[PDB]
Write an enzyme that holds these catalytic residues in place. Structure first.
Site, PDB file in Angstrom:
ATOM      1  N   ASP A   6       0.824  -1.238   0.000  1.00 53.73           N
ATOM      2  CA  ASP A   6       0.000   0.000   0.000  1.00 53.73           C
ATOM      3  C   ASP A   6       0.850   1.277   0.000  1.00 53.73           C
ATOM      4  O   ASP A   6       0.935   2.027   1.009  1.00 53.73           O
ATOM      5  CB  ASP A   6      -1.069   0.063   1.120  1.00 53.73           C
ATOM      6  CG  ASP A   6      -0.712  -0.814   2.316  1.00 53.73           C
ATOM      7  OD1 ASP A   6       0.494  -0.806   2.726  1.00 53.73           O
ATOM      8  OD2 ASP A   6      -1.639  -1.533   2.807  1.00 53.73           O
ATOM      9  N   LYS A  42       1.468   4.968  -1.020  1.00 50.99           N
ATOM     10  CA  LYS A  42       0.610   6.180  -1.024  1.00 50.99           C
ATOM     11  C   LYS A  42       1.546   7.395  -0.886  1.00 50.99           C
ATOM     12  O   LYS A  42       2.753   7.251  -0.510  1.00 50.99           O
ATOM     13  CB  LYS A  42      -0.335   6.194   0.182  1.00 50.99           C
ATOM     14  CG  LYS A  42      -1.280   5.040   0.280  1.00 50.99           C
ATOM     15  CD  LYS A  42      -2.068   5.137   1.580  1.00 50.99           C
ATOM     16  CE  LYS A  42      -1.619   4.082   2.587  1.00 50.99           C
ATOM     17  NZ  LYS A  42      -2.635   4.062   3.684  1.00 50.99           N
ATOM     18  N   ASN A  85       3.715   7.980   2.137  1.00 55.24           N
ATOM     19  CA  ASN A  85       4.764   7.073   2.409  1.00 55.24           C
ATOM     20  C   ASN A  85       5.979   7.616   1.760  1.00 55.24           C
ATOM     21  O   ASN A  85       7.070   7.068   1.954  1.00 55.24           O
ATOM     22  CB  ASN A  85       4.393   5.703   1.846  1.00 55.24           C
ATOM     23  CG  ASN A  85       3.093   5.174   2.435  1.00 55.24           C
ATOM     24  OD1 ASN A  85       2.393   4.409   1.795  1.00 55.24           O
ATOM     25  ND2 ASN A  85       2.766   5.599   3.655  1.00 55.24           N
TER      26      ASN A  85
END
Ligand SMILES: CCc1cncnc1N1CCN(Cc2nc3cc(C(F)(F)F)ccc3[nH]2)CC1
Ligand SMILES: [Zn+2]
Length: 318
Positions: free
Chosen positions: A139, A141, A144
């Site tokens: 995940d 994003k 991050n």
């Protein structure tokens, strides 16, 4: 004079709170004893008692610890110490004063192709090395992705989830999660090139490619996959995104036998000298205003700290 250092919580001074969540806190801290005294770090503090309640949480926590020790790379955050007490786990990572790179989007409204290009390439390097070491990011994003002092990409969350919310894939934003993650049809090494796709899109339009009115609807839109390509896009950015954002895994660019190199060989990256790029020798398009707390807040204040895990304890070399 007197030993090597046993790093302890009392080696650090708590300066601001950078992030709060269910499982622990991220502080901004200064080391005040030995070694680098006076240097600033980020200190992630995790609650042991609540992690060991759940095996999937124990995995990421242990994995993060593992990955950060074993997978060092210029576009991935450095772990510098790790250590534990009864009831708590501590991780001292490098302090990333550039802040989030999607905050630069707030101010730029949207990113120039050549500017997104730099950030996307550096990102890809990190992802590509991450694969060479057999790690799939799940995940990814815009949160991050952070920026060091001089403004180069650094990847960021490899442990638990920041949320305090906990409702593990549906706790925060799903707009950058491949269909397969939603269809629970696994993942794969090509799940991360989807995510790179979604990031590019956002980087240029300021929104993820498919959003809905609500979760149910969002998830739907994504699965529906109809792709909207703003006019103001150059042909190659168009080209690149079509390939990347592909419903079917097998068909994405970066999926092949060699894949982050092929992604990189795309004409959108024709101007990118990887040699100097990875040497961090190209000046970044954005250089923000060491202790500067500016790009995390205003939300975060009030500094104060609330079997397995063998070998957690760690000091980086260099
Ligand atoms: C430690 C790396 C970093 C370095 N320099 C400046 N900023 C950074 N941050 C600060 C913000 N952070 C997001 C975040 N992850 C979290 C994890 C938790 C958890 F405790 F795991 F539950 C809690 C809050 C969290 N906030 C991204 C990395
Ligand atoms: Zn969660």
């Amino acid at each position: 004079n007197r030993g090597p250092e046993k790093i302890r919580p009392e080696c650090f001074e708590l300066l601001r709170v950078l992030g709060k969540g269910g499982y622990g806190k991220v502080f901004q801290v200064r080391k005040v004893t030995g070694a680098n005294t006076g240097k600033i770090f980020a200190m992630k503090v995790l609650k042991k008692a609540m992690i060991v309640r759940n095996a999937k949480d124990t995995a990421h926590t242990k994995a993060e610890r593992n990955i950060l020790e074993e997978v060092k790379h210029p576009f991935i955050v450095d772990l510098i110490y790790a250590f534990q007490t009864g009831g708590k786990l501590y991780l001292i990572l490098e302090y990333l004063s550039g802040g989030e790179l999607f905050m630069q989007l707030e101010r730029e409204g949207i990113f120039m192709e050549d500017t997104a290009c730099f950030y996307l390439a550096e990102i890809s390097m990190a992802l590509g090395h991450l694969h060479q070491k057999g790690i799939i990011y799940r995940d990814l994003k815009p949160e991050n992705i952070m920026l060091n002092h001089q403004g180069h990409v650094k990847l960021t969350d490899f442990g638990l989830c920041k949320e305090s919310i906990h409702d593990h894939t549906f706790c925060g934003t799903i707009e950058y999660m491949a269909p397969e993650i939603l269809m629970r049809s696994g993942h794969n090494r090509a799940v991360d090139w989807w995510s790179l796709g979604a990031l590019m899109y956002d980087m240029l339009t300021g929104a993820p490619p498919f959003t809905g009115e609500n979760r149910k609807k969002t998830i739907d839109k994504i699965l529906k996959c109809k792709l909207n390509l703003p006019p103001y896009l150059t042909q190659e950015a168009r080209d690149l995104l079509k390939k990347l954002l592909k419903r079917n895994a097998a068909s994405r660019l970066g999926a092949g036998p060699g894949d982050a190199g092929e992604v990189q060989a795309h004409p959108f990256f024709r101007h990118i000298n990887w040699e100097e790029l990875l040497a961090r020798k190209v000046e970044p398009p954005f250089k923000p205003l060491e202790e500067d707390v500016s790009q995390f807040d205003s939300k975060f204040t009030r500094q104060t700290p609330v079997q397995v895990f063998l070998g957690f304890t760690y000091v980086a070399p260099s």
